Amino acid sequence: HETAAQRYSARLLQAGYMADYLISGGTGYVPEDGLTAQQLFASADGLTYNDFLILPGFIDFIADEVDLTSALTRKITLKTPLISSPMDTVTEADMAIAMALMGGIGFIHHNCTPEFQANEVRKVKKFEQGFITDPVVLSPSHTVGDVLEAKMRHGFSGIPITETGTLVGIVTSRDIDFLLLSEVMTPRIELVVAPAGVTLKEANEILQRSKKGKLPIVNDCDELVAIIARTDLKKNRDYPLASKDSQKQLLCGAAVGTREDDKYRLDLLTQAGVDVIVLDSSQGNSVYQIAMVHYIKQKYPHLQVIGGNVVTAAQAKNLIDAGVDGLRVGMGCVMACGRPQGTAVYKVAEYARRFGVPIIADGGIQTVGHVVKALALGASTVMMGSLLAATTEAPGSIQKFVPYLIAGIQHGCQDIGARSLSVLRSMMYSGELKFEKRTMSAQIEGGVH
Amino acid sequence: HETAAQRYSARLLQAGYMADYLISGGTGYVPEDGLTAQQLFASADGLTYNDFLILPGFIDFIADEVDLTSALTRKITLKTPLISSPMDTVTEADMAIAMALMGGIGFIHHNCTPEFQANEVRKVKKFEQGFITDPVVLSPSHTVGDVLEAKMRHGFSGIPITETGTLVGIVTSRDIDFLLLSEVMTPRIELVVAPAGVTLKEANEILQRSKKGKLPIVNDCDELVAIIARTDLKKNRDYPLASKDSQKQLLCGAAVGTREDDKYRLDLLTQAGVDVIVLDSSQGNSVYQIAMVHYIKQKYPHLQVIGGNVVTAAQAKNLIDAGVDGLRVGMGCVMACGRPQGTAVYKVAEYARRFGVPIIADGGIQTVGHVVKALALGASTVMMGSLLAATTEAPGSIQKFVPYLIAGIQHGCQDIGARSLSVLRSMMYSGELKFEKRTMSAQIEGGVH
Ligand SMILES: Nc1ncnc2c1ncn2[C@@H]1O[C@H](COP(=O)(O)OP(=O)(O)OP(=O)(O)O)[C@@H](O)[C@H]1O
Ligand SMILES: Nc1ncnc2c1ncn2[C@@H]1O[C@H](COP(=O)(O)OP(=O)(O)OP(=O)(O)O)[C@@H](O)[C@H]1O
Ligand SMILES: Nc1ncnc2c1ncn2[C@@H]1O[C@H](COP(=O)(O)OP(=O)(O)OP(=O)(O)O)[C@@H](O)[C@H]1O
Ligand SMILES: Nc1ncnc2c1ncn2[C@@H]1O[C@H](COP(=O)(O)OP(=O)(O)OP(=O)(O)O)[C@@H](O)[C@H]1O
Secondary structure, eight states: OOOOHHHHHHHHHHHHOOTTTHHHHHHOOOOOEEEEEETTTTOOOOOSTEEEEEOOOOOOOTTTOOOOOOOOOSSSSESSSSOOOTTTOOSSHHHHHHHHHHHHHHHEEEOOOHHHHHHHHHHHHHHHHOOOSSSBBBBBSSOOOHHHHHHHSSOOOEEESSSOOOOOOOOOOOGGGGGOOSSSOOSOOSSOOBOOOOOOHHHHHHHHHOOSSSEEOOOTTTSEEEEEEEETTTOOOOSSOOOTTSSSOOOEEEEEOOOOGHHHHHHHHHHHSEEEEEEEEEEEBBHHHHHHHHHHHHHHOOOOEEEEEEHHHHHHHHHHHHHHOOOEOOOOOOHHHHHOHHHHHHHHHHTTTTTTTOOOEEEOSSHHHHHHHHHTTOEEEEEETTTTTTTTTTOOHHHHHHHHHHHHHHHHHHHHTTOOOOHHHHHHHHTTOOOEEOOOGGGGSOOOO | OOOOHHHHHHHHHHHHHOOOTTTTOOOOOOOOOOOOOHHTSOOOOOOOOOGEEEEEOBSSSSSSSOOOOEESSSSSESEEEEEEEETTTTTTTHHHHHHEEEEETTTEOOOOOHHHHHHHHHHHOOOOOTTTOOOOOOOOTTTTTHHTTTHHHHHHEEEESSOOOOOEEOOOOTTSSSSOOOOOOBBBOOTTOOOOOOOHHHHHHHHHHHOOOEEEEEEETTTTTEEHHHHHTTOOOOOOSSOOOOTSSSSOEEEOOOOOGGGGHHHHHHHOOSOOOOOOOOOOOOOOHHHHHHHHHHHHHTTTTEEEEEESHHHHHHHHHHTTTTTEEEEOOOOOOOOHHHHHHHHEEEEHTTTTTEEEESSSSOOHHHHHHHHHOSSSSEEEEEEGTTTTTTOOOOOHHHHHHHHHHHHHHTTTTBBHHHHHHHHHHHHOOOOOEOOOOSSSSSSOO
């Protein structure tokens, strides 16, 4: 970790022209200008995000070397400091897949029956990046008029056929478009198809020879195990920001309530193999939400748990020493309680950091500037709210839209002169990064309104 | 009364796992975060209720165990911290009954002849829950046309009859629908009258057998004393939040002016039996209000007196040491005097408290958040203003509406972690409850505008 004075003096000696390094070290002087974060929050006002700025630094790297690696919980790590919020208006299994493919995570909302949430988790854990998730397969006992309508029900129309479930051939639109006819098309006589477990490059080369649209994957027992459709192999992108677990399949989380009736919901989700739980609660520091934490850590010692909403170091203490591995730092964005967001994030992050429990800055983030700030104050990850609602993956497109935010954060953390979010926060806690307040007159000019 | 550190450490030892109780007591450490109330008002910015928040605490009880018992004056106590304001657009005998049935009190306005206010008090003191207050009795000498029109005057039409006023029979629409006679209607024959005063639950059984619409209440003198109507027995609710005096009938108050002409108004109201007087005045600390106070305490030593409006500890001193038993803490919510309401409530409550003289936070309260605040700052009761105008009791129904505010206050004082308003204030004065300021940027984002 090199100070801006160390970076300038070293890189100036790399460019080329004594008792300067020997009389003040690599700290070759810089003017003190603006406030350190510890001073900015000392006046005890409710500084929100619109209210402060980050004074620019020294730049010695390009805007595409700003490592974004962030930490979600004590053991889960992410390539992107973003998250989708556990709301019915935002996250379901489609957006949970989309976020994980962009190096983040998503949390499945809990405004549903417990079985539905476990099904939506299962739907994410089994994604495979080119195979069809949960293929529809039909029985020869069923009349093809009740396969022809499925095109009116699900929209797709090339259906594989077998005795009841995941062998005979396929029925597709070209078997039906000239005609109710019981079922009388394509026995087990398909062309070149995947005989066992296969790769996506191998399927791309087989589909090129075969020219057909569906490709079964069968097993050694010579029955269907998965299926491919050509239309997806035409488009499936590279995703280096993978967000995969130790079994090389997507990370995803689930929200759970804190009620007595929720040990059952938490079972079904842990049987679906969910990676992390967020305890959804308007105020996390309650006796029965601490009982819920002690209960999870006693029964499923592998499951990561993120504590419910807090905004003080006293709440953060009681949830941490209960054993939680994260924290949603956000509340009050009519109520009579809460805290101004910017002060909440700074105070909880600075407290949690003493043990290593990264936090999650949820609430009232609505620009990429607010994201860069929340990350400079101490938040480890920012939970995108209704900002993602009315994108086409919500119950623009998330896959095309997340790169915009990434490039914006990278440009920001480049103007600040911090080559990786971990360094941004180190540069903040050590007082090397400087901040300035704003009068209302100075934000009505150049922003806000 | 136990602190968040005492409650967490004790309740953790109820669940189970040393020289940690023996080296710092039940105060097992919590982070200092936010301002105590004494610090919040030290800056001498005049705050109002929109300017601060209450940092959330530790929760260990349900939102329905938040005892709301508050103290109106040194001797009158209320089950609910609400009041209806003494305004013509708000309080009259109907709303005064409605507030007392919801565990609060109401103060009858004084924009009237003194006789009218004494009548509206008399109407409130004599309520009796099931019985008709002030029944209409007609004379056997009246022609039916002057009874039949009363249905056009008062709307009801089952009129009991006797010589002039509070039985010799009844007359109802069924006696009159076919017709003008002068007397042909039901003479004394009535199906199980109440022979004396009776329990409302006994009358509920009598109406079930009798099937008639009216039930006379009579006396051993063989004459009327009260009457019951069947339609009210179908709907009378439980009211456990009673607000009743030692004589087991409703509490109510009256506003009086401070003029020389008002010893007469104060007589008529004290003859009607009013429980508490509020001295209405734009500024309470005047020689002729202190004369009015000394005068009441010299002539009616039983009557509770609430001092007219103040906003400083210097005003509060002069009225307290005059002998008043309460205080409307509110002024100026264009006139060149006054105070920002949040600072007024805190300063007057903190001063009065030295003697035990609870105050009443009147002015500019327009949400349930502001109510929870005014109660956290020191106000003992909050006087609902034009917030209650355009309800059906205003000269959408107060009986149905007050439970909303109650549940809201209870949810608030649950998030704050204080099991009973008396504990909320104890937790504030002892500096355990922490507050935060809010820049305009922090309330332009999180509600309010
Ligand atoms: N067996 C299947 N079960 C469920 N969905 C399927 C199946 N086969 C294809 N799909 C859906 O179709 C998408 C891509 O294939 P495509 O749309 O070309 O199917 P298709 O059957 O060939 O459609 P169509 O016959 O109308 O042209 C997949 O991403 C998936 O959403
Ligand atoms: N892997 C396969 N091997 C052999 N024949 C196949 C295979 N997959 C599909 N078929 C058959 O080949 C024909 C074309 O099917 P295809 O996969 O192209 O779907 P389709 O409905 O015809 O697609 P599209 O509507 O876009 O033209 C159909 O008779 C179908 O049953
Ligand atoms: N004798 C009465 N004197 C005064 N008020 C009365 C009297 N009888 C009824 N009321 C008023 O009328 C309300 C409804 O009473 P009730 O339903 O018995 O009316 P009613 O006599 O049957 O009228 P109607 O014959 O027109 O239906 C009561 O709550 C009360 O406010
Ligand atoms: N307590 C009573 N005992 C005996 N007769 C009564 C009594 N009260 C009313 N009546 C008579 O019984 C008849 C019906 O009276 P009731 O009170 O049921 O009519 P109402 O409810 O006022 O009229 P409506 O049915 O239109 O609302 C009338 O002749 C009335 O004078």
